[PDB]
């Protein structure tokens, strides 16, 4: 996918664009797991 | 006894208030939005017989204790009710001090402001949370959608809106509510079954019936041929154990309850079905958003968990939409939590703590602060 | 031995079955809806000692013969009972062949269909009336109201509904029942008087008590100051001849029986008073129907014949209604017959014979015919 | 009143409107007497 | 039973159809452009309960009967509706034969031709009027202006155009519509008041709200300082009797309804305020027509009857116009009738009967005739 690395290297907020670009309607979830990590 | 804090993802799911934390994964709070009054007072030794522990126990006290939503119509008629509702939360199931954990606030549109005004200040004072912040339940699901473009159909705990959206971009003008609540379906169910040979009015009687819907009541895509099916279809002709121990028998209702959301005639409502609410919204949407919708036809609302939900959704939109365009309604199974989930996200969205309702900000601007450039 | 026919205006007034003809003016039939069983059977020479001639004689046989409504709760538990009830009617007091006189049928809502299904066919076969036709007792009174707009409060023989209406236009959604029956008041009366020094349980004991209510028991507009009044008011403190010959003494009951229709607390019922049933109905009504109601606040139901009936009706609606609007409840003295009267009208409504239940129509469509596009 | 003549000359069913217009909630009764005549 | 004829000055005022005759002085016809459907059909004896007598009675039947404009958007979606609308007119309030009285026809621009095609022929056949003739509502007001030079702002029954004109000389190129309709303002009103604590959706609910606007809702010249005024100005803070009998309370809305005609942001419309529509039109106008406008800044449209209407008109044009030139908007109080008035004039303009749509002319050229060298 690279969505992992791309989003980690995505522009800080535009993980919006990258997640929802690569099908990740759960940018919500991408960040929420990243938050269970960073929560 | 830990690091800075966890925001308090508290969600009064239109029927149940529910909550976890920021970054949480499951609302650790879930339970009825009712208050309960016993009647008789058999003179009973001792005490412990609360008037109003509804929370999640009172249904244990169902029958003697009556029922009270404060937000009855997604409309908080009373607050101290909801107040101790919160305290119950924060101190029995949240069993947690507000004062040190932030919280985002779940709300549907259409609320006269003072509702939030009051909720806000009192949350500070009674609660002194580090800071609060409100957010439209609708919007909350929206991010909970993450398909930042497209409408979402929010027919949830007991709520109903259409939420046209477009990479986060939603048109309130096109946005709408359907007063319908699974409670409403509940209603017509009582109507029918009772008149059909049943005497079913009591609060927890309503409890059983709502259980009935959410466990067995459904809808078939079609009606009229579906009607003929009903005319003799024995398979549906199934009795369910009434939790007295009776086995309530069931037929055409199991579906003839919800479907009226497309025809309030049955609720007699002047309104129109959810679907064409969607469709007139979309037509309101710009010329070619509509395909966006079609890919983004996000349903929301668990009580709508019934069969075929999309099945119809698509079929009628078809019946209305140009086959030119390709439709796709969107509805996760987990639509109850979805709203909670996206709220957990936003609040948990670290890059975003600037928004939370600070004690001070209120203080200087009182509650009215909340309104402009903030909610 | 005459011209075409007279429809058979047969009315099972929730307590008594009653009837005349189309265009009639007085239901020539009126009598209890009970069945009666003796116990002992003293070995008695000869015969003529019917088990079940209740009709209007059995109360002559009260005591030994027990009591049986088939429609007990406005719910026909049994029919052959009611069957010979009819025959009694048609052959002793109607003493008339069904087969050649049409009849409209009196019914309250809330009935599972097969009740009417069965009643219908059997009325054809056992009865071969030229044709029948059913009609909601509620609606029957309604035309019996002739104020085609406005609700009617039908608390009658033993029944209770609210009947919002509007030049014939009624909203079933807003329409309701109150399980209360003058029988119910009967009940609490037995409760009180007995516990208060009396031993009053027996079937015709209930007979006497119902007589008591319908002759003397009343209500005072107010309660609590009315309560103090009761505290020493000697005028009410009146004993009535118990039909044994005793003179049952009476005080606060005479009114503390019925009034609970506004507070089932006394019946302990979860329900709410008749008045606010009216009011929540009306609020359900459109914005400005409400004044229509206010002019059309038609009570119905003779057992409710008590004092002040409207007196409260208005006072509380006031207490709830905007004085902006001007209220007027409507209740003829003759509310028992009213329902009969309007039925006599409709059935007697020559321009309307198309509706009657024809033997054939049933025949082709069996009873199920009755339901769609007909009743 | 003229309700008599008006209703006799009222439109056949809308004796409804005329009776209940001229206060005759007993269009019911107007017809029931008319029926004791025509019953 | 008289001399030649009177043309039939029939005017479907965008909300109400209205009319008199040629040379008349008051449109003897005025009433809603709606159709009405009841829902329930309480089984009601007898008849007289029309489905669709909307005309001017149905609002009597409001609530049960729903609402239908055929010209909904100044767009006749349906005609037989409007057909019997006419007949109603011509036979109940016009109660007059079309066949023998000529009529001019009121129309706004933007209509695809067949609309008029059909209306025309059918008016001949169903109507056989001596001859008809159509005329732009816009133009009709225009002569109704009689300031043959200058634009007119036609924001009327529910319509909106700019009508640059110059001794009868108007530039369609510069001419425009604003989709806004007092109905639209109605809308945002419902939006606000409802969300603000109200549940206001129903057809006649819309009726009340439109009444509200046309009786009380206004606008203040300014906004933002006007906004601060609103911030506490108690005088405006006035509740009006809701025609249920409630007294709907009113504040900032009374003006925050209409004003958005200058800022569709509130309607969210991409469009621009009426004023600068005027101004860009005028700039389109020749170099020095503009002063003509300034003397001829004729408003039109009663729903725009609100306060300050010109007050703003001038202030903003000022804000845009060179003070070099002196502005003067023109708006009679009687702007509803104005259009009717000028139509009564033109049609009544004897020197002009040559124009009317003759049966024959159509006949030879069918309807298509209407278009070239005629309308």
């Amino acid at each position: 996918e690279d969505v992992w690395e791309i989003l980690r290297q995505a522009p800080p907020s535009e993980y919006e664009r990258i997640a929802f670009q690569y099908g990740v309607t759960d940018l919500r979830g991408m960040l929420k797991r990243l938050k269970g990590m960073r929560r | 006894d830990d690091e800075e804090t966890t925001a308090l993802v508290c969600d009064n799911g239109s029927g149940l208030v529910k909550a976890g934390f920021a970054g949480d994964d499951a609302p650790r709070a879930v339970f009825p939005s009712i208050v309960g009054r016993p009647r008789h007072q058999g003179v009973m030794v001792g005490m412990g017989q609360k008037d109003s522990y509804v929370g999640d126990e009172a249904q244990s006290k169902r029958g003697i204790l009556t029922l009270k939503y404060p937000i009855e119509h997604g409309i908080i008629t009373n607050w101290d009710d909801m107040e101790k509702i919160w305290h119950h939360t924060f101190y029995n199931e949240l069993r947690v001090a507000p004062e040190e954990h932030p919280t985002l606030l779940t709300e549907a549109p259409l609320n006269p402001k003072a509702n939030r005004e009051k909720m806000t200040q009192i949350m500070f004072e009674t609660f002194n949370v580090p800071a609060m912040y409100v957010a439209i339940q609708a919007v909350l699901s929206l991010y909970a959608s993450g398909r930042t473009t497209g409408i979402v159909l929010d027919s949830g705990d007991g709520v109903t809106h259409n939420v046209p959206i477009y990479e986060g971009y939603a048109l309130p003008h096109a946005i709408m509510r359907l007063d319908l609540a699974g409670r409403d379906l509940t209603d017509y169910l009582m109507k029918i079954l009772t008149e059909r040979g049943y005497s079913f009015v009591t609060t927890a009687e309503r409890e059983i019936v709502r259980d009935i819907k959410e466990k067995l009541c459904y809808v078939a895509l079609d009606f009229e041929n579906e009607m003929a099916t009903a005319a003799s279809s024995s398979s549906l002709e199934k009795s369910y154990e009434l939790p007295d121990g009776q086995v309530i028998t069931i037929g055409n209702e199991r579906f003839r309850c919800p479907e009226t959301l497309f025809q309030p005639s049955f609720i007699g409502m002047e309104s129109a079905g959810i679907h064409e609410t969607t469709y007139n919204s979309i037509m309101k949407c710009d010329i070619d958003i509509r395909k966006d919708l079609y890919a983004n036809n996000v349903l929301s609302g668990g009580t709508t968990m019934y069969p075929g939900i999309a099945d119809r959704m698509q079929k009628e939109i078809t019946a209305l939409a140009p086959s030119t365009m390709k439709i796709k309604i969107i509805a996760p199974p987990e639509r109850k939590y979805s709203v909670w989930i996206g709220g957990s996200i936003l609040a948990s969205l670290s890059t975003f703590q600037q928004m939370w309702i600070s004690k001070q900000e209120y203080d200087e601007a009182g509650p009215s602060i909340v309104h402009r450039k903030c909610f």
Side-chain angles (χ1 to χ4, degrees), chain A, chain B:
Chain A
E1 312 169 290
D2 309 331
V3 300
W4 298 95
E5 55 170 85
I6 297 169
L7 284 161
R8 299 279 175 80
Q9 302 162 321
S13 186
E14 291 12 14
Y15 302 177
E16 296 164 316
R17 283 305 302 115
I18 282 168
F20 297 165
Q21 273 159 357
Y22 291 97
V24 175
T25 199
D26 291 329
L27 182 68
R28 181 176 63 252
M30 183 278 288
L31 282 72
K32 184 186 67 65
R33 66 202 73 190
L34 190 73
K35 281 179 299 195
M37 183 278 288
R38 84 159 196 200
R39 182 179 65 81
Chain B
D1 54 358
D2 66 340
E3 288 184 353
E4 314 153 354
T5 191
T6 181
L8 295 175
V9 64
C10 55
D11 305 348
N12 65 1
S14 296
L16 284 73
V17 285
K18 286 80 74 172
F21 293 101
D24 277 354
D25 294 331
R28 42 189 68 190
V30 182
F31 61 91
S33 311
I34 294 298
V35 178
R37 297 289 77 80
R39 275 78 55 183
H40 72 115
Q41 182 65 41
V43 176
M44 308 173 198
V45 294
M47 187 66 204
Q49 297 81 19
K50 174 52 177 94
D51 185 74
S52 200
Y53 291 166
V54 173
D56 185 78
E57 61 84 30
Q59 60 285 35
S60 310
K61 234 13 53 216
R62 44 209 162 270
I64 189 64
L65 280 296
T66 184
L67 64 84
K68 280 80 68 180
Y69 302 106
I71 192 71
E72 299 81 1
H73 190 179
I75 62 172
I76 292 296
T77 61
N78 180 8
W79 294 270
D80 51 348
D81 54 6
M82 187 66 204
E83 293 179 354
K84 278 74 69 177
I85 286 164
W86 304 353
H87 162 286
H88 181 74
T89 305
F90 294 97
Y91 302 78
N92 305 314
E93 64 276 18
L94 294 175
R95 74 280 188 193
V96 61
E99 304 63 13
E100 70 296 5
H101 287 301
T103 193
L104 165 53
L105 278 296
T106 77
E107 53 264 18
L110 289 69
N111 181 357
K113 282 40 125 194
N115 194 328
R116 294 91 59 191
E117 287 277 289
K118 64 177 72 67
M119 64 183 73
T120 61
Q121 76 275 16
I122 188 59
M123 294 182 286
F124 285 170
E125 297 88 7
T126 302
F127 293 95
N128 294 63
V129 299
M132 64 183 73
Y133 182 76
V134 301
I136 300 299
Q137 62 84 30
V139 191
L140 295 174
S141 56
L142 310 185
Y143 181 79
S145 180
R147 275 295 78 88
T148 49
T149 293
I151 190 167
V152 69
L153 181 59
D154 55 274
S155 178
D157 210 305
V159 65
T160 305
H161 291 288
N162 307 332
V163 190
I165 297 169
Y166 182 75
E167 60 277 5
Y169 293 91
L171 160 59
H173 296 311
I175 297 169
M176 204 48 193
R177 191 270 194 282
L178 182 62
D179 200 1
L180 183 62
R183 179 38 179 57
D184 292 331
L185 281 299
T186 302
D187 315 333
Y188 181 75
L189 182 63
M190 65 184 73
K191 285 64 180 169
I192 48 176
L193 183 63
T194 298
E195 186 277 333
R196 177 69 274 172
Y198 293 89
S199 85
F200 293 164
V201 302
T202 68
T203 287
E205 208 164 18
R206 283 78 63 91
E207 171 49 23
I208 296 170
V209 298
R210 48 196 166 246
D211 311 332
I212 302 157
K213 64 175 181 181
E214 283 280 353
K215 65 177 72 66
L216 270 296
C217 311
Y218 48 76
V219 175
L221 277 296
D222 72 330
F223 181 76
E224 293 82 3
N225 290 318
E226 171 285 349
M227 286 293 103
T229 298
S232 85
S233 166
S234 297
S235 66
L236 62 95
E237 318 189 310
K238 57 178 65 64
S239 179
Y240 181 76
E241 168 281 325
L242 188 154
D244 70 344
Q246 192 276 341
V247 61
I248 192 65
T249 302
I250 298 89
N252 65 6
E253 51 287 18
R254 211 168 318 140
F255 62 84
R256 294 144 58 262
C257 181
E259 80 294 16
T260 190
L261 74 163
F262 306 102
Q263 68 296 9
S265 65
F266 304 153
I267 63 171
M269 186 66 204
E270 65 166 4
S271 63
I274 75 166
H275 64 279
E276 73 288 26
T277 298
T278 299
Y279 204 110
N280 64 7
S281 64
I282 63 176
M283 64 184 73
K284 295 184 288 292
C285 295
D286 69 1
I287 189 66
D288 302 0
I289 185 63
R290 68 194 207 177
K291 64 90 175 179
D292 305 321
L293 278 296
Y294 305 159
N296 298 60
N297 299 115
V298 176
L299 180 62
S300 43
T303 311
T304 301
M305 61 79 71
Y306 292 171
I309 304 301
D311 294 326
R312 186 183 297 278
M313 295 299 102
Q314 291 81 16
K315 63 178 163 319
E316 65 269 12
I317 140 99
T318 303
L320 277 296
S323 71
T324 62
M325 284 73 74
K326 307 298 94 177
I327 188 73
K328 187 269 183 182
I329 296 89
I330 296 88
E334 296 81 3
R335 291 180 290 116
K336 11 231 219 212
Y337 295 96
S338 51
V339 299
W340 180 98
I341 301 299
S344 62
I345 319 310
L346 187 153
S348 296
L349 295 176
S350 72
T351 46
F352 293 94
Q353 287 69 241
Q354 61 291 0
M355 53 210 68
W356 284 241
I357 302 299
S358 67
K359 259 68 178 171
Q360 53 89 28
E361 60 86 20
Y362 188 115
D363 292 331
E364 311 94 17
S368 60
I369 190 167
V370 65
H371 299 289
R372 75 278 190 188
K373 205 75 172 182
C374 52
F375 308 98

